[PDB]
Amino acid sequence: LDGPYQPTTFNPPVDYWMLLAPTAAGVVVEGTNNTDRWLATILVEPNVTSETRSYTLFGTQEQITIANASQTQWKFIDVVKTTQNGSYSQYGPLQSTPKLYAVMKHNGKIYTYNGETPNVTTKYYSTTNYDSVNMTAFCDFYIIPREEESTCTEYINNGL
C-alpha cells in the first residue's frame, strides 16, 4: 500500500491497481487513450431516482442521466465512450459501503471493480495502447501491485 498520493494526472504502470479514496460525490478518476477509449468513474450518492446531472468530463460539461437504486450504498459508475465524439454509456456498477474504488491497466484493457461490497468482483474494457493511458485522479489514491490484488479487494470490500 503505497500512498496516499494527492490528486494528479500521471501514467500509472501496468498491472498496478490505483485505489481511489473519494470523499465527495462526483468524478473520481478519468483516463483516455485519445483514440478508442474514454473512461470516467463517477460516484453517486445513495438513493437517487433517475435524474440528469452535469459533470465535467475531460474538461467539458456533459449531461448524464444517473440513478442509484440502493437506499444505503454508494454507486460507482464507469461512464465510457469509444470515439471522441461518441455518447457516454454506463457500465458497472459497484455498489459500495466503504467508498473505495480501483482501476488498473492490464492485458490490453482497463479493469475496474464491480458488484456489491462486501463481495466484489472486477470487469474490464478493451483499450488500444492500454499501457500508455494517463489517469487523472480527482481524490487521494494509493498504488497496489496486481500480485497483491487480494489486499486491494479486501480494501474495496471492507475499507482501509
Ligand X SMILES: CO[C@]1(C(=O)O)C[C@H](O)[C@@H](NC(C)=O)[C@H]([C@H](O)[C@H](O)CO)O1
Binding flags for ligand X, 66-85, as an x/- string (CB under 6 A): --------------x-x---
Closest C-alpha to 103, from 35, 23, 33, 14: 14
- Distance separating alpha carbons of residues 104 and 110, to the nearest angstrom: 6
- The answer to whether 126 and 4 are in contact (CB under 8 A) is no
CB 109 to ligand X: min, Å: 6
* Nearest residue to ligand X, by Cβ distance, number only: 126
Q: Count CA atoms within 13 Å of residue 82 on its CB side.
A: 8
CB 57 to ligand X: min, Å: 15
Site for ligand X in 29-68 (CB under 6 A): none
Residue among 4 and 86 whose Cβ is closer to ligand X:
86
Binding flags for ligand X, 121-160, as an x/- string (CB under 6 A): --xxxx----------------------------------
- Alpha-helix runs per DSSP H in the chain: 149-158
Closest C-alpha to 125, from 112, 134, 113: 112
Question: Does residue number 91 form part of the binding site for ligand X (CB under 6 A)?
Answer: yes
Would you tell me which residues interact with ligand X (CB under 6 A)?
80, 82, 91, 123-126
